[PDB]
Design a protein around this ligand. Structure first.
Ligand SMILES: [Mg+2]
Ligand SMILES: [Mg+2]
Ligand SMILES: [Mg+2]
Ligand SMILES: [Mg+2]
Ligand SMILES: [Mg+2]
Ligand SMILES: [Mg+2]
Ligand SMILES: [Mg+2]
Ligand SMILES: [Mg+2]
Ligand SMILES: [Mg+2]
Ligand SMILES: [Mg+2]
Ligand SMILES: [Mg+2]
Ligand SMILES: [Mg+2]
Ligand SMILES: [Mg+2]
Ligand SMILES: [Mg+2]
Ligand SMILES: [Mg+2]
Ligand SMILES: [Mg+2]
Ligand SMILES: [Mg+2]
Ligand SMILES: [Mg+2]
Ligand SMILES: [Mg+2]
Ligand SMILES: [Mg+2]
Ligand SMILES: [Mg+2]
Ligand SMILES: [Mg+2]
Ligand SMILES: [Mg+2]
Ligand SMILES: [Mg+2]
Ligand SMILES: [Mg+2]
Ligand SMILES: [Mg+2]
Ligand SMILES: [Mg+2]
Ligand SMILES: [Mg+2]
Ligand SMILES: [Mg+2]
Ligand SMILES: [Mg+2]
Ligand SMILES: [Mg+2]
Ligand SMILES: [Mg+2]
Ligand SMILES: [Mg+2]
Ligand SMILES: [Mg+2]
Ligand SMILES: [Mg+2]
Ligand SMILES: [Mg+2]
Ligand SMILES: [Mg+2]
Ligand SMILES: [Mg+2]
Ligand SMILES: [Mg+2]
Ligand SMILES: [Mg+2]
Ligand SMILES: [Mg+2]
Ligand SMILES: [Mg+2]
Ligand SMILES: [Mg+2]
Ligand SMILES: [Mg+2]
Ligand SMILES: [Mg+2]
Ligand SMILES: [Mg+2]
Ligand SMILES: [Mg+2]
Ligand SMILES: [Mg+2]
Ligand SMILES: [Mg+2]
Ligand SMILES: [Mg+2]
Ligand SMILES: [Mg+2]
Ligand SMILES: [Mg+2]
Ligand SMILES: [Mg+2]
Ligand SMILES: [Mg+2]
Ligand SMILES: [Mg+2]
Ligand SMILES: [Mg+2]
Ligand SMILES: [Mg+2]
Ligand SMILES: [Mg+2]
Ligand SMILES: [Mg+2]
Ligand SMILES: [Mg+2]
Ligand SMILES: [Mg+2]
Ligand SMILES: [Mg+2]
Ligand SMILES: [Mg+2]
Ligand SMILES: [Mg+2]
Ligand SMILES: [Mg+2]
Ligand SMILES: [Mg+2]
Ligand SMILES: [Mg+2]
Ligand SMILES: [Mg+2]
Ligand SMILES: [Mg+2]
Ligand SMILES: [Mg+2]
Ligand SMILES: [Mg+2]
Lengths: 190, 57, 76, 137
RNA sequence: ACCAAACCGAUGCAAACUCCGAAUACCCAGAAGUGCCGAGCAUGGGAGACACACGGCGGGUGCUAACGUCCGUCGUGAAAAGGGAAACAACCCAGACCGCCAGCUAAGGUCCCAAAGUUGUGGUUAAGUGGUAAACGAUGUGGGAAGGCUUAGACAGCUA
RNA sequence: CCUAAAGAGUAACGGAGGAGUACGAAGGUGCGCUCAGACCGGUCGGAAAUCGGUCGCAGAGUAUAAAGGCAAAAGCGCGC
RNA sequence: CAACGGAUAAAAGGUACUCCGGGGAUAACAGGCUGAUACCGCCCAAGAGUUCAUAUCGACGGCGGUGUUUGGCACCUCGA
RNA sequence: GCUUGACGAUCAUAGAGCGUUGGAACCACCUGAUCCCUUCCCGAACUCAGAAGUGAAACGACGCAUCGCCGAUGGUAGUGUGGGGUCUCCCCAUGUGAGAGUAGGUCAUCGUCAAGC
């Protein structure tokens, strides 16, 4: 499931880190956060690359296992090769039972076939954004935020305030007094 | 507290900074071995010309 | 072409660095404007030149509001 | 042909093209993209040529973004002219491309149709390319 | 119903943009040792030279063309022989006081021309690739991580 | 000013601009004061004149190009 | 005295009638390096071909080869 | 030990905003323009003589992270020296190592003198 294995990294630097990717086939990583000193760990590339095609990979909670001591983490940021695209570095944020945390949550758009602006007016659908910054307690962190586009007419805009959210979830950008277009309907290009 | 240093590569065409590092330890022609103290000032002239010397410890 | 012009270089910059001993009348920095301001023991020429007025050692401190960079002379 | 409406200076030095593209290498607007895997420079007539070939194939809906803008002037000295006597006039405009830069984006089409159209465009460009989907990060 | 400053967010570029910002290099001071017995400075006798070349690195110009041209900084030639790169000033190794029918090595090499392993261990290539060259194309071949069907009969063939 | 490679210097029939002046106060000193701009209200002027208020902090200004400076303002006014 | 370290207070042209001293330190011919240009191949396929992209052509774009035209450079030859 | 006033150190982890509060003393607004003095007009500002009112404005203190400002660990880019490749560009050994971003932090900390408890 959401299981990752790690070993304690000891050699730090550019030359040491370039050697892991070339010979050992491992990936440097960091486990910071919580109330502890940060820990530098390493993990195998073919295992992190297999957890990353799960759709709810970043918005779920991982069970990291460093050596024989396991704990609760979350994919906080990720580094990829600009050209090839594989992952080079990754950092994990520790999860505390009573502490607010932030995450990136993808949006599950639904029932676009029977939208009023598409079935009747013959318009298109454009997803302006595909994830939203959220902030919530770990116990109620959603896998996806569901946006419903059934009763949408041609030219009608959908903003952050339009979509619903589960309990105890803030949209961060909305809290900053900045709601922005999520999706819209418009006439065909040609 | 002392280290052997042997010059094993030619001084021809080396940077003038590296030539004066070898001359600063007392090495003059190839396959010459000298007795120098293991002091931080001397230890830093060896590292600047690592590729030219053979250090026997 | 209508471009081939330039002017002689003026040799500007710092002449004495931090820690150097100074004498009275010694020129410290040559400037256009004031990148550096005259601190304790230093004077300002009419073309914005910093010169020593006492004997000592260059300091090169930045302090005060406005984030100014000061050149001062201290005890040796 | 894309080119700036006005420029501060008419000419530029040749410069050098170095480094990977850590900025401009993410699928930001669209949902499928054509990334560059080799470095070079597009001459603003290939950017224009490769855009006919991409919108013509979809020919039904879809939104297309162009993430490359040619903003660097280049000069050519005329024929039968000696060396020196100034710098040549501006002929065309190019864009510096580094490995990893995303060139074209598209959405509102099937994944299979995106692959066809981006192969039409890539044949008009003088550098290696790739097909990239979109990720959360 | 077109255009639309202004603002909010997302997203690129700059030798003559900068909220930032190195490694080196440069200036100064205190210290051990080395210096061919001196290196530094000053004052005098005598000069030659002020037509440079290529290679590496950082740039302008040219077409990021030229054994092109113009700068900065190193190395060699000039003024440097010897061994290697077949032959080959400027590349690699190394700096010739003289003699020896003595030994050890550098770069480069060890089937024959032609001195020295037809040495040992595990793979790859079938193209004389090695021993010249791109976009692009192809059931050539070795290794790896995974997938979709499958004795409820999978994929090719054949009878409705 | 850039080339010019974060000390100085550094070439091309390389890329861009200026000068061959002005001022008896546009100098000295003492004292005093902050600009451009936006919005609102106001007789004709109306996007733009003079006036009142709020915001703003230098996006103004410097005899003259560009760069570097400018709150003890180096910007503005008055007396001697 | 701007030709701005200013030859004098005071100064323009022709030579195919020409002449001397030199230079491949520097051009015209041919050789060499390069290949912008030139010529010859190939990749993509909007299209023309009654329908049908490739019988025959092929836009907008891209990749090469040969030294083969117009050039670039000035390495050899000005005691031919 | 506490409050108020004056002068400094340091220049945002110290600022901006948004709320609460202080008049016994201090400070401020305040009363008037005969005198000193002032306005390119005007007691608005400067100045003088004060003691009827109010802490409304201003100032000070106290709270909050909303903006701002600080900001790690790790990774990445660049880079001196030596050596390589398919040499417009990169790679290896070794030393060095940002900018942006992430977790987070901040509603300052001191010194001298004079008044009142
Ligand atoms: Mg390294
Ligand atoms: Mg060498
Ligand atoms: Mg110029
Ligand atoms: Mg010029
Ligand atoms: Mg110059
Ligand atoms: Mg200059
Ligand atoms: Mg003075
Ligand atoms: Mg150039
Ligand atoms: Mg960039
Ligand atoms: Mg720059
Ligand atoms: Mg500028
Ligand atoms: Mg001697
Ligand atoms: Mg002499
Ligand atoms: Mg002499
Ligand atoms: Mg001389
Ligand atoms: Mg010369
Ligand atoms: Mg010359
Ligand atoms: Mg030279
Ligand atoms: Mg040369
Ligand atoms: Mg070069
Ligand atoms: Mg060049
Ligand atoms: Mg270039
Ligand atoms: Mg040359
Ligand atoms: Mg060259
Ligand atoms: Mg020599
Ligand atoms: Mg000579
Ligand atoms: Mg030789
Ligand atoms: Mg030889
Ligand atoms: Mg050869
Ligand atoms: Mg030989
Ligand atoms: Mg031997
Ligand atoms: Mg060997
Ligand atoms: Mg023979
Ligand atoms: Mg033999
Ligand atoms: Mg054998
Ligand atoms: Mg062969
Ligand atoms: Mg061959
Ligand atoms: Mg400039
Ligand atoms: Mg400089
Ligand atoms: Mg430098
Ligand atoms: Mg020069
Ligand atoms: Mg002029
Ligand atoms: Mg003035
Ligand atoms: Mg005056
Ligand atoms: Mg007004
Ligand atoms: Mg002030
Ligand atoms: Mg003259
Ligand atoms: Mg002259
Ligand atoms: Mg003269
Ligand atoms: Mg005559
Ligand atoms: Mg006649
Ligand atoms: Mg003659
Ligand atoms: Mg002659
Ligand atoms: Mg010649
Ligand atoms: Mg000449
Ligand atoms: Mg001939
Ligand atoms: Mg010729
Ligand atoms: Mg010849
Ligand atoms: Mg060729
Ligand atoms: Mg047709
Ligand atoms: Mg020929
Ligand atoms: Mg030719
Ligand atoms: Mg030459
Ligand atoms: Mg001749
Ligand atoms: Mg002859
Ligand atoms: Mg003859
Ligand atoms: Mg008053
Ligand atoms: Mg920051
Ligand atoms: Mg770090
Ligand atoms: Mg680092
Ligand atoms: Mg940082």
């Amino acid at each position: 499931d959401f299981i990752l294995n790690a070993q304690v990294r000891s050699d730090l630097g550019k030359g040491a880190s370039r050697r892991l990717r070339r010979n050992a086939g491992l990936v440097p990583a960091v486990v910071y956060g919580g109330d502890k000193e940060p820990q530098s760990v390493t993990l195998e590339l073919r295992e992190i690359a297999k957890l990353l095609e799960n759709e709810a990979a970043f918005s779920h909670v991982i069970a990291l296992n460093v050596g024989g001591a396991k704990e609760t983490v979350l994919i906080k940021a990720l580094q990829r090769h600009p050209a090839k695209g594989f992952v080079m570095h990754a950092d994990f944020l520790r999860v505390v039972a009573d502490h607010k945390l932030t995450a990136h949550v993808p949006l599950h758009f639904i029932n676009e076939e029977v939208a009023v602006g598409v079935k009747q007016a013959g318009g298109e659908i454009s997803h302006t954004i595909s994830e939203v910054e959220v902030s919530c307690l770990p116990k109620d962190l959603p896998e996806f935020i569901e946006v419903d586009m059934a009763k949408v007419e041609l030219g009608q805009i959908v903003h952050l305030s339009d979509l619903k959210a589960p309990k105890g979830v803030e949209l961060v950008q909305l809290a900053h007094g900045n709601d922005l277009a999520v999706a819209n309907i418009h006439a065909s290009r040609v | 507290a002392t280290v052997k240093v042997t010059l094993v590569k030619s001084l021809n065409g080396r940077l003038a900074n590296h030539k004066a590092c070898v001359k600063g330890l007392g090495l003059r022609r190839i396959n010459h071995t000298v007795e120098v103290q293991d002091t931080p000032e001397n230890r830093g002239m060896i590292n600047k010309a690592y590729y030219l010397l053979r250090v026997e410890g | 072409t209508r471009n081939g012009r330039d002017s002689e270089s003026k040799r500007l910059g710092v002449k004495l660095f931090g820690g150097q001993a100074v004498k009275a009348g010694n020129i410290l920095v040559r400037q256009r404007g004031t990148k550096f301001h005259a601190g304790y023991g230093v004077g300002l020429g009419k073309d914005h030149t910093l010169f020593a007025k006492v004997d000592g050692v260059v300091k090169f401190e930045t302090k005060g509001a406005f984030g100014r960079k000061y050149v001062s002379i201290v005890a040796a | 042909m894309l080119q700036p409406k006005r420029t501060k200076f008419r000419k530029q030095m040749t410069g050098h093209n170095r480094g990977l593209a850590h900025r401009g290498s993410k699928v930001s607007f669209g949902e499928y993209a054509l990334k560059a895997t080799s470095r070079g420079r597009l001459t603003a007539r290939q950017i224009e040529s490769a855009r006919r070939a991409l919108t013509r194939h979809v020919k039904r809906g879809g939104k297309i973004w162009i993430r490359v803008f040619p903003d660097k002037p280049v000069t050519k000295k005329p024929l039968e002219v000696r060396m020196g006597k100034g710098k040549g006039g501006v002929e065309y405009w190019v864009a510096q491309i580094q490995p990893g830069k995303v060139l074209y984006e598209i959405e509102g089409v099937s994944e299979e149709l995106a692959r066809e159209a981006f192969a039409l465009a890539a044949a008009k460009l003088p550098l290696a390319t790739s097909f990239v989907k979109r990720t959360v990060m």
